[PDB]
Amino acid sequence: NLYFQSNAMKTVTVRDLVVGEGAPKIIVSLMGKTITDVKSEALAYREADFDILEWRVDHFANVTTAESVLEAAGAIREIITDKPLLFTFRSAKEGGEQALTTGQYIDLNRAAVDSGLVDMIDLELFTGDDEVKATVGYAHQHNVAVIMSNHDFHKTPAAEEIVQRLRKMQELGADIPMIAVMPQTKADVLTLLTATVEMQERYADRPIITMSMSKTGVISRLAGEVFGSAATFGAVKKASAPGQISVADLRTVLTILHQ
């Protein structure tokens, strides 16, 4: 593996895909419980118009069996050969389906990095500063990029707190800081957009991904080009988080806004 990054241009290039330039990139989540479910999903996804494939490993039943994880990743790579693969174990507390100890989670991500089968890994900021920082370094030594993430499924923190978290992710070495928050009011949606603008304009030297979840926050998933979110999640069959619209509708809006 080998990816490129330009601090000056605020871009990260994985498999020829230039993140942080032009229209926002579409990410879709693959969720399969077993290895054949993963194969079936990968086959169905092959035709969808997305840019990055996220494997939601927390949906995989045999996540604690090293060989099963490798077989699943290999199966995805054999079916989806030309697009960046992002390895994401999303913890239950942050919107996921299972929970691992810190040691298991870190070991899991290290094994994914070692496999050479994934282009990117997701690391949750709140896992711990030292553990996260060591794992970012480890990923980079193997030419694997890192999307560092944080989520709040109940509320939207103040704009300044959102900005400080995104800056913290940069500090720890994240290639692409990412934050997802839940609006309780319309103003909360604007708060997330305000933080996106402030971060991207005054502190960022790389791409960032932000979103206000739920139907109320969907505009944050569409207006990335103007406000500064480099990527956005769409749904193929079903949503991996509240607020995502179909990949087809997402592409339609991104194209209309790019022109």
Ligand X SMILES: O=C(O)[C@]1(O)C[C@@H](O)[C@@H](O)[C@H](O)C1
190 part of the interface to a copy of itself, by CB under 8 A: yes
C-alpha to C-alpha distance for 117 and 120, rounded to whole angstroms: 9
241 part of the interface to ligand X, by CB under 6 A: yes
Q: Which partner from the list ligand X, a copy of itself, none does 131 bind, CB cut-off 5 to 8 Å by kind? A: none
- Among residues 50, 105, 227, 233, the one that binds a copy of itself under rule CB under 8 A: 227
Residue 192 identity: L
- Among residues 231, 240, 247, 254, the one that binds ligand X under rule CB under 6 A: 240
Q: What is the DSSP letter of 24?
A: P
Q: In terms of residues, how long is the chain? A: 259
98 part of the interface to a copy of itself, by CB under 8 A: no
DSSP string of 41-102?
HHHHHTTS--SEEEEEGGG-TTTT-HHHHHHHHHHHHHHS-SS-EEEE--BGGGT-SB---H
Q: Which partner from the list ligand X, a copy of itself, none does 227 bind, CB cut-off 5 to 8 Å by kind? A: a copy of itself
229 part of the interface to ligand X, by CB under 6 A: no
201 part of the interface to a copy of itself, by CB under 8 A: yes
Pair 109, 89: CB distance under 8 Å = yes
Pick out residues in 129-188 that bind a copy of itself (CB under 8 A): 186-187
95 part of the interface to ligand X, by CB under 6 A: yes
Task: Count other C-beta atoms under 10 Å from residue 101's C-beta.
Answer: 8
Joined together, the tokens standing for residue 135 give 């794992």
Tell me the C-alpha to C-alpha distance, in Å, between residue 1 and each of 80, 84, 117, 139, 231. Answer: 16, 11, 9, 11, 22
Q: How far is the CB of 176 from ligand X (least distance, A)?
A: 12
Site string for ligand X, 25-64 (x = CB under 6 A): ----x------------------------x-x--------
- Among residues 135, 149, 196, 210, the one that binds ligand X under rule CB under 6 A: 149
127 part of the interface to ligand X, by CB under 6 A: no
Q: What angle do the packed helices 66-79 and 35-45 form, to 10 degrees?
A: 20
Give the E-state strand segments of the chain in sequence order.
Answer: 4-6, 11-14, 17-19, 25-30, 52-56, 85-88, 120-124, 145-152, 176-181, 209-212, 231-234
211 part of the interface to ligand X, by CB under 6 A: yes
Residues in contact with ligand X by CB under 6 A are 29, 54, 56, 88, 90, 95, 149, 151, 180, 211, 213, 233, 240-241, 244
Residues in contact with a copy of itself by CB under 8 A are 186-187, 189-190, 193-194, 197-198, 201, 215-216, 218-219, 222-223, 226-228, 245, 249, 252-253, 256-257, 259
